[PDB]
Curated annotation (Swiss-Prot), chains A, B, C, D:
Keywords: Biotin, Secreted, Signal. The chain holds residues 38 to 158 of 183 of the full protein. The lineage of its organism: Bacteria, Bacillati, Actinomycetota, Actinomycetes, Kitasatosporales. This is Streptavidin. It comes from Streptomyces avidinii. Homotetramer. One of its GO terms (molecular function) is biotin binding. Its main location: secreted. Biotin binds at residues 34, 45, 83, 99, 111.
């Protein structure tokens, strides 16, 4: 099993009230669903990603990332978000991320294609 | 099939000489391998991601993203990169991305955990 | 005077314990000093920047940005940080920022030149 | 004088056809004007920033950054952009940047406040 397979797997919530449901595989896989509390989104979207299944044992966090394309059976926002961050284990476990949201654009609007932000996920709230 | 399933699937190269080998699934999946020409990396790493399988038909690009965790059988850089971008089809097809590279860090060094950059992928070179 | 000239001018502290001392000019100027609690830094560094001196009156925040080059009489970290964000007025005034830290690099290391992060500044702590 | 004071001072153009007119001071200051070819912008806007006036002599680039608040006598886009990057001297001098564009937003829309992109400036075109 991955060192933090058990720590990462489950339900996480961010500061916006979004819900991230993830399974961490022994081999580094992340699979699950994302539900955004904000933006052009409804219900759950597929996510996939990767994590470091053998992190440093010096108290460093565990690097990971995942992607959501904002298409499901309900809506298509012609966009994708990637979260890049680290899992920090312990009593108040956190996933601390920064994210990039890219929209499909014309060449003329491509300079404005991409938003950047930061989300912090906890196991409560 | 996804609108750009055929356009995205295959081998791509970026401005650094890295190699991205991807299969686009009918359902929005991206699966493949990444080989970085730079950094703490050797040989291929697993990637997974997502793309908009039903993009706008107004000449906008196709949003997509993917993740590599920099662990394979050879090396572990305790880091993950996410690329967020859009596929632009036609004679000189491109994937234009921005990326976030997060390292596992101590809490003291977490302010310096994440690099940001931009890669442009083409089908030649 | 700028709408938030009085609100912005003064001493701010971020989540790292850094100190930002700024004067907002009637014309949109930001001038002052920055002292980082972390990284290759000691004592104060010059900053300059700009803010929107006539923001929207719909309860939107006030856009602003500034730069520090990490050279002073004590040290030179061959780097510069830019903070981009908005001032949100009221009882618990905040400046919410994202930042880019670029180091001078060789062409070979330029892919790793730039860090991205987020700082939140308050008038206390 | 700054090592690259003479190299930086003058007129630069980016890949969008924007015009950046900058004076580099002996002490690290950047002052000038910016004219964007794209977005909610017309004519020139004030910029200020900083650069490393004593860079490494190992062939590394020169770190620098600057800010534009998108208010002038013609328009107010209630936003500010910061460019963070490095100057690379020689026959085909370049300023390679990444940028953050923050808009004033309501708290509800603050997750979508900030765009990220990359501009490359040359002395011709």
């Amino acid at each position: 099993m991955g060192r933090d397979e058990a720590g990462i797997t489950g339900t996480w919530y961010n500061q916006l009230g979004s819900t991230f449901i993830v399974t961490a595989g022994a081999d580094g896989a992340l699979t699950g669903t994302y539900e955004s509390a904000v933006g052009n989104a409804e219900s759950r979207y597929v996510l996939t990603g990767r994590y470091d299944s053998a992190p440093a044992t010096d108290g460093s966090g565990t690097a990971l990332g995942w992607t959501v394309a904002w298409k499901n059976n309900y809506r298509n926002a012609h966009s994708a978000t990637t979260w890049s961050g680290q899992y920090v284990g312990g009593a108040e476990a956190r996933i601390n991320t920064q994210w990039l949201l890219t929209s499909g654009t014309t060449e003329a609007n491509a300079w404005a294609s991409t938003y950047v932000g930061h989300d912090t996920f906890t196991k409560v709230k």
